[PDB]
């Protein structure tokens, strides 16, 4: 089925292809430095490079060739980061959606399944790009002064006379029954299933790790309960950045005449989101229901975990896979595809969904699930020069990275016994202070330095 054939794309060593507008070279530096420090092998290119070009066709040909060349060397990019708005990386009109899509940058071979996890850091200025980066770095380096906002979520089944009872409430109730609850570490699960919605967006300010809205949308708003781009600019969640998902129409229509809701929620300074998942064209009630809960869900009936396939919520909470922002959207699209394949009621089709949904902001973030755990590690007093690998003790599954000045020298994943073989692609030949970073899904990062 679609789950066996097109599972989670995340793989190690992490490799990322970055295609960016030339005006963003300087602003990108801190984000690229941190991604290298945490173990990403980066291949960074700008549209002022003739090999890349500035057109939809040239950029796409460039990305497809980088993917195929990478694959040929068993070094395929895992992520594709598009940096800029449509004035620098246009996207193209969806064959099914008739609206802008980034799908065809990521879809290299003949089907509609992406080869890479693609996200767009959409900004109209270097300042707006830095706003996104600063939120991402605080979240991923876990430098926020109050981590307790991570134990809280906001879930809204918005207004619709026919579908709030049929799909909105069953979706949110499924999320709360199995995952967004005290058993999973969540202390505050703000949820609005029906009117009155009074005060539902105050929680965005007081602090949430995650905000999910399912109902009507517009290019610049969650329609009812209303949250406009003007209200997003007035948010006050300093040091409390979240992932937001709009399972609604057109909030991620990023070629719109005005910055769309997804663009504003990620671009706003020291408030809003570090990432947004939403749809460029209309989304449909049927497919959105499967997207969140899984296929085999029935309208107007609260779905069970055993009675449905894997949806976006289910994937999010698997401990060992689907641990990135992009993988949450990937799992949702898989469930909407599976529902069509097995003959559930569908309203639009799988191809349309793969063209529709987008990540705005940083899709490579690994979101925490309530309070992240403290990792266990042992770092040596020093690192001897000219070694093919180092053995570093860390909890099983931890990703260890050694770097200096934003240049990644080596990576390794801790084995079952808690030992990582850090394979050095660049051997340490000069004395100095080298960065050691240890990450693991739903664990606080370990950020240290070792002398050589």
Strands (E), 209-264: 210-214, 217-218, 221-222, 227-228, 242-247
| Long-range contact pairs involving 335-338 (C-beta distance under 8 Å, separation at least 24) | 335/290, 335/291, 335/292, 335/293, 335/294, 335/295, 335/309, 335/310, 335/311, 336/287, 336/288, 336/290, 336/291, 336/295, 337/2, 338/1, 338/2, 338/3, 338/290, 338/294, 338/295, 338/309
Residues that bind Na ion (CB under 5 A): 187, 294, 308, 311, 314, 318, 322-323
What x-and-dash track marks residues 216-235 binding ligand CKC by CB under 6 A? xx------------------
Q: Look at residues 81, 71, 85 and name the one whose alpha carbon lies nearest to residue 115.
A: 71
Which pair of structure tokens corresponds to residue 193? 């299933």
Separation of alpha carbons 323 and 326, rounded Å: 9
**85 annotated to bind ligand:** yes
Name which of residues 139 to 168 contact Ni ion (CB under 5 A): 148, 151
254 belongs to an annotated ligand binding site: yes
Answer yes or no whether residue 71 interacts with ligand HIS by CB under 6 A.
Answer: no
What phi and psi, each to the nearest 5 degrees, are found at residue 122? Answer: -80, 120
Nearest to 279, CA basis, from 348, 360, 335:
360
CA distances from 452 to 2, 61, 218, 386, 405 (A): 48, 43, 55, 11, 14
The answer to whether the CB of 154 falls within 8 A of the CB of 211 is: yes
Contact 409, 425 (CB under 8 A): yes
> At its nearest, how many Å lie between ligand HIS and the CB of residue 245?
24
Considering only residues 135-194, where is the footprint of ligand HIS by CB under 6 A?
A: 148
When CB distances to ligand HIS are compared, the closest residue is 371
Q: Which is nearer to ligand CKC, 218 or 237 (CB)?
A: 218
CA distance 353 to 334: 9
Give me the catalytic one of 200, 203, 248, 249.
Answer: 249
Residues 272-331 that bind ligand CKC (CB under 6 A): 282-283, 285, 288
Secondary structure letter of residue 374 according to DSSP: P
Separation between Cα atoms, residue 113 and residue 2, nearest integer Å: 10
Bridge partners of residue 411, in order along the sequence: 401, 423
Interface of this chain with ligand CKC, residues 178 to 217, rule: CB under 6 A: 214-217
Q: Please tell me whether residue 444 binds ligand HIS under the rule CB under 6 A.
A: no
* Closer to Ni ion by Cβ: residue 152 or 267: 152
What is the chain's Cα-based Rg?
21
The set of residues, in sequence order, having a beta carbon less than 8 Å from that of 355 and lying 6+ positions away, is 94, 95, 96, 97, 99, 101, 103, 112, 280, 281
196 upstream amide cis, omega within 30 of 0: yes
Minimum distance from residue 250 beta carbon to Ni ion (Å): 37
260 tagged catalytic? no
Is the Cβ of residue 122 or residue 251 nearer to ligand CKC in the bound state? 251
318 contacts which partner out of Na ion, Ca ion, ligand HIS, none, CB within 5 to 8 A by kind?
Answer: Na ion
- Please select the residue that binds Ca ion; options are 24, 39, 85, 253, rule is CB under 5 A: 85
Catalytic residue among 203, 216, 338, 358: 216
* Binding segment (CB under 5 A) for Ca ion, from list 91-99, 222-230, 249-257, 277-285: 249-257
Comparing CB distances to Na ion, the nearer of 34 and 174 is 174
Residue 337 interacting entry, from ligand CKC, Ca ion, Ni ion, none, C-beta within 5 to 8 Å by type: none
Identity of the residue, 182 or 341, whose beta carbon is nearer to Ni ion in the bound complex? 182
In the complex, the smallest distance separating the C-beta of residue 332 from ligand CKC, rounded to whole angstroms, is 11
Rule CB under 5 A: which of 110-139 touch Ca ion?
Answer: 111, 113
Q: Is 371 in the site for ligand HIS (CB under 6 A)?
A: yes
Give the residue closest to Na ion by C-beta: 294
Tokens of 174: 């499924």
Shortest-Cβ-distance residue relative to ligand CKC: 249
Asked if 45 contacts 144 with a C-beta cutoff of 8 angstroms, the reply is no
64 in active site: no
* Residue ranges that bind ligand CKC, judged by CB under 6 A: 214-217, 247-249, 282-283, 285, 288
Residues tagged active-site: 216, 249
* Residue ranges that bind Ca ion, judged by CB under 5 A: 85, 109, 111, 113, 254
**Where is the binding site for Ca(2+), in residues?**
85, 109, 111, 113, 115, 254, 263
């Amino acid at each position: 089925d679609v789950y066996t054939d097109h599972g989670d794309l995340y793989n190690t060593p992490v490799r990322m292809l970055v295609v960016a507008g030339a005006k963003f070279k300087e602003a990108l530096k801190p984000w690229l430095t941190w991604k290298a420090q945490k173990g990403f092998y980066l291949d960074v290119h700008y549209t002022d490079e003739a090999e890349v070009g500035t057109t939809n066709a040239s950029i796409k040909a460039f990305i497809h060739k980088k993917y195929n060349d990478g694959l040929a060397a068993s070094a395929a990019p895992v992520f594709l980061a598009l940096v800029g708005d449509t004035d620098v990386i246009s996207g193209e009109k969806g064959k099914k959606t008739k609206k802008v899509t980034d799908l065809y940058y990521s879809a290299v071979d003949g089907d509609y399944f992406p080869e890479m996890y693609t996200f767009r850091m959409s900004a109209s200025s270097p300042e707006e790009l830095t706003n996104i980066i600063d939120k991402v770095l605080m979240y991923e380096k876990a430098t926020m002064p109050d981590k307790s906002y991570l134990e809280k979520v906001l879930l809204i089944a918005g207004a619709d006379y026919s579908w709030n009872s049929q799909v909105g409430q069953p979706t949110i109730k499924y999320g709360m029954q199995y995952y967004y609850n005290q058993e999973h570490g969540y202390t505050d699960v703000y949820n609005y299933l029906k009117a009155p919605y009074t005060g539902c967006y105050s929680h965005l300010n007081t602090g949430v790790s995650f905000a999910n809205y399912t109902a009507h949308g517009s290019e610049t708003a969650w329609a009812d309960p209303l949250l406009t781009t003007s209200q997003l600019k007035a948010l006050t969640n300093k040091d409390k950045y979240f992932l937001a998902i709009g399972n609604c129409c057109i909030t991620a229509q990023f070629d719109y005449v005005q910055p769309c809701f997804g663009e504003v929620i990620t671009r706003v300074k020291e408030k809003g989101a570090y990432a947004y998942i939403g749809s460029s064209p209309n989304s449909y009630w049927g497919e959105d229901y499967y997207w969140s809960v899984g296929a085999n869900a029935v309208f107007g009936v609260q779905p069970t975990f055993e009675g449905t396939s894997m949806g976006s919520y289910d994937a999010t909470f698997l401990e060992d896979s689907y641990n990135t922002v992009n993988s949450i959207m990937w799992a949702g699209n898989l469930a909407a595809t599976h529902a069509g394949n097995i003959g559930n009621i569908t309203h639009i089709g799988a191809h349309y969904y793969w063209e529709a949904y987008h990540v705005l902001g940083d899709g490579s973030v690994m979101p925490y699930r309530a309070m992240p755990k403290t990792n266990t590690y042992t770092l040596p007093a020093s690192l001897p020069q000219n070694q093919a690998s180092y053995s570093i003790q860390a909890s099983a599954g931890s990703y260890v990275a050694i770097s200096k000045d934003g240049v990644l020298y080596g990576t390794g994943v801790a084995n079952a016994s808690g030992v990582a073989t850090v394979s050095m692609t660049k051997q340490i030949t000069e004395n100095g202070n080298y960065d050691v970073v240890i990450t693991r899904s739903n664990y606080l990062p370990v950020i240290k330095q070792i002398q050589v």
